[PDB]
Write a protein that binds this ligand. Structure first.
Ligand SMILES: Cc1cc2nc3c(=O)[nH]c(=O)nc-3n(C[C@H](O)[C@H](O)[C@H](O)COP(=O)(O)OP(=O)(O)OC[C@H]3O[C@@H](n4cnc5c(N)ncnc54)[C@H](O)[C@@H]3O)c2cc1C
Ligand SMILES: C[NH+](C)c1cc(NC(=O)CNC(C)(C)C)c(O)c2c1C[C@H]1C[C@H]3[C@H]([NH+](C)C)C(O)=C(C(N)=O)C(=O)[C@@]3(O)C(O)=C1C2=O
Length: 368
């Protein structure tokens, strides 16, 4: 049941892009309105791990899991100390190398983009407004023609602004803060640090600061530093490089000389506060027209527990099915049901993520 109409996915993330396929597979008419300028736009951020059981189910259900195993690269993980000592190393074992192999965010999108029918994604669409008209929604896009649709699936990330028709819940900051960079030609530009990783992820922890790194994101080193947000911040300048460098050289003064090599080797740092979009209040029972929310727009959550795209790919799988079912009658109950299941696990995940982030920053911890 439920055909003859069309869908509008605002946001071509990993999650929305997946969602376009699972609908377009079962013959539903979808469009993905994405704000990026063109497909070849560089995606900042590290590597996704799709878990067997959640993320991977979604890639399976679309016929892409082998394509995901093809492009993803399984990684082992070291754990180091401020002095550079390897304390542990779980390398990849031949059977469970298919557990969560790291795939690059652009690689993933290229896979999802091939799966979709041509012109499924209309690019240069920054959705600014939603008016719920007659039998459908009017969607307005900055300096581009408006369009209309029966169902609007919100996939536009943790800081989506058009949530109000679903919930008046708003994102909160978490209390921790994350700095991130890329380093190109890591082998020569951060030679000491690249070696300490030995082709493996690298996770350190000292006195409330946390460093993470991936030595191989298509030949780029991506590292990330996390800390309880300095109290002095409320309501540095990440545009000014050696201003972020000095902050970091203070915070990381006691660490080995090799990590400092990383910091003075990165050109541009990007600042991010950790945020949560809590599943506290049940979303509105009263909704003018059919609308729902998957991905980081549904449950933005701290990036410290492997959740985020997996919850998002799952809630893609779940919702997508509820629509393609003749096992449903009313779309209002077809999404009410997707929203039932996600409140369960998102909360489960948010609890984990919020929990893990309490765990670190608290005096020297062991890792997972
Ligand atoms: C430091 C860090 C590390 C993380 N690590 C992991 C990890 O290791 N594993 C994991 O599973 N998750 C991780 N996450 C979380 C993860 O990136 C998200 O859960 C994931 O990106 C999925 O969200 P979307 O794809 O659901 O949202 P997004 O990735 O945020 O994609 C949103 C899309 O919609 C577009 N868009 C945004 N606004 C608009 C608009 N107004 N109109 C139209 N389009 C719009 C965007 O441009 C983009 O294409 C991490 C996050 C951070 C900050
Ligand atoms: C507890 N912390 C340490 C943690 C835990 C898990 N796993 C679990 O919580 C599940 N617990 C089990 C193991 C099932 C018992 C985790 O799965 C993770 C993480 C940490 C993040 C670190 C991220 C990092 N960024 C933020 C700087 C990074 O460099 C990368 C990367 N590949 O480049 C990440 O992808 C990162 O986001 C990431 O994946 C983390 C975890 O996967």
């Amino acid at each position: 049941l439920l055909s003859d109409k069309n869908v509008a996915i605002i946001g071509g993330g990993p999650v929305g892009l997946t969602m376009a396929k699972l609908l377009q597979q079962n013959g539903i008419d979808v469009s993905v309105y994405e704000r990026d300028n063109d497909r070849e736009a560089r995606i900042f951020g590290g590597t996704l791990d799709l878990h067997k059981g959640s993320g991977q189910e979604a890639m399976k259900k679309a016929g892409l899991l082998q394509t995901y195993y093809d492009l993803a690269l399984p990684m082992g993980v070291n754990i180091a100390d401020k002095k550079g000592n390897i304390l542990s190393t779980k390398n990849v074992k031949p059977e469970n190398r298919f557990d969560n192999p790291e795939i690059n965010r652009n690689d993933l999108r290229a896979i999802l983009l091939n799966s979709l029918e041509n012109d499924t994604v209309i690019w240069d669409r920054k959705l600014v407004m939603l008016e719920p008209g007659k039998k459908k929604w009017t969607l307005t896009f900055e300096n581009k023609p408006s369009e209309t649709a029966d169902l609007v699936i919100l996939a536009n990330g943790g800081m989506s602004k058009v949530r109000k028709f679903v919930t008046d819940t708003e994102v909160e900051e978490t209390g921790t803060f994350n700095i991130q960079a890329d380093i190109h030609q890591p082998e020569i530009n951060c030679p000491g640090f690249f070696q300490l990783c030995n082709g493996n992820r690298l996770m350190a922890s000292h006195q409330g600061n946390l460093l993470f790194a991936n030595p191989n994101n298509n030949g780029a080193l991506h590292f990330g530093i996390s800390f309880k947000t300095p109290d002095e911040w409320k309501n540095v300048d990440f545009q000014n490089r050696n201003s972020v460098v000095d902050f970091l050289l203070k915070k990381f003064s006691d660490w080995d000389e090799r990590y400092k090599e990383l910091i003075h080797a990165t050109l541009s740092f990007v600042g991010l506060a950790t945020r949560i979009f809590p599943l506290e209040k049940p979303w509105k029972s009263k909704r003018p027209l059919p609308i729902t929310m998957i991905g980081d727009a549904a449950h933005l959550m701290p990036p410290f527990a492997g959740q985020g795209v997996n919850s998002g790919l799952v809630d893609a799988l779940i919702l997508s099915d509820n629509l393609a079912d003749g096992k449903f009658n009313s779309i209002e109950e077809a999404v009410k049901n997707y929203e039932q299941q996600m409140f369960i696990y998102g909360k489960e995940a948010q609890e984990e993520s919020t929990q893990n982030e309490i765990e670190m920053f608290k005096p020297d911890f062991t890792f997972q």
